[PDB]
Amino acid sequence: GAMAPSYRVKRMDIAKNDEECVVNAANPRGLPGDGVCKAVYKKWPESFKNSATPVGTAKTVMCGTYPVIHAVGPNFSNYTESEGDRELAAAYREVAKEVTRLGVNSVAIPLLSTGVYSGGKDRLTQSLNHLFTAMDSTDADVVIYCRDKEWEKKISEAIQMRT
Numbered sequence: 001g002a003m004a005p006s007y008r009v010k011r012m013d014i015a016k017n018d019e020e021c022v023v024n025a026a027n028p029r030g031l032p033g034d035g036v037c038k039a040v041y042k043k044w045p046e047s048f049k050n051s052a053t054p055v056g057t058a059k060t061v062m063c064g065t066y067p068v069i070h071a072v073g074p075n076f077s078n079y080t081e082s083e084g085d086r087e088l089a090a091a092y093r094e095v096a097k098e099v100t101r102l103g104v105n106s107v108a109i110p111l112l113s114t115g116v117y118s119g120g121k122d123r124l125t126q127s128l129n130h131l132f133t134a135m136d137s138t139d140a141d142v143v144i145y146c147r148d149k150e151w152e153k154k155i156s157e158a159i160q161m162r163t
């Protein structure tokens with residue numbers, strides 16, 4: 001456990017994280033993919049051995065001793081708003097279980113279902129609130145990674161609103 005478990009946000013490539021494990025925004029088939037998944041494949045390609053897992057689940061694969069948690073958010077192009085919301089909540093709950101099982105003191109995590117799986121909608125608040133519901137009962141330091149300047153501001157404001 002971290003001494004004083006915290007949430008932080010950084011605007012940078014999650015492949016350059018300073019945490020004890022990483023969450024990949026994975027596809028269900030364990031393919032290299034695009035965006036976060038692309039950077040993650042370049043940095044930890046050994047972690048894609050048997051990484052396929054269903055929507056709403058997380059599967060950990062070790063790259064050496066460094067854990068990669070493949071978390072599969074729903075593609076809102078295919079899911080109804082209702083079913084997609086349930087599967088996005090479930091994926092983050094499975095991340096919290098894996099982070100707990102691994103005994104890490106820190107985790108790097110992206111906002112699931114916010115890029116090419118967004119169905120063309122802004123899902124910052126939806127995805128972040130499901131991240132909090134799952135991770136609030138864990139004692140790992142959580143570092144959220146994003147790329148947009150405006151998203152960084154809103155994520156920081158949401159963290160500080162709870163403090």
Ligand SMILES: [Cl-]
Nearest residue numbers: 011012013016
């Ligand atoms: Cl960067």
Ligand SMILES: [Cl-]
Nearest residue numbers: 114115116117
């Ligand atoms: Cl996405």
Ligand SMILES: [Cl-]
Nearest residue numbers: 146147148151
């Ligand atoms: Cl972003």
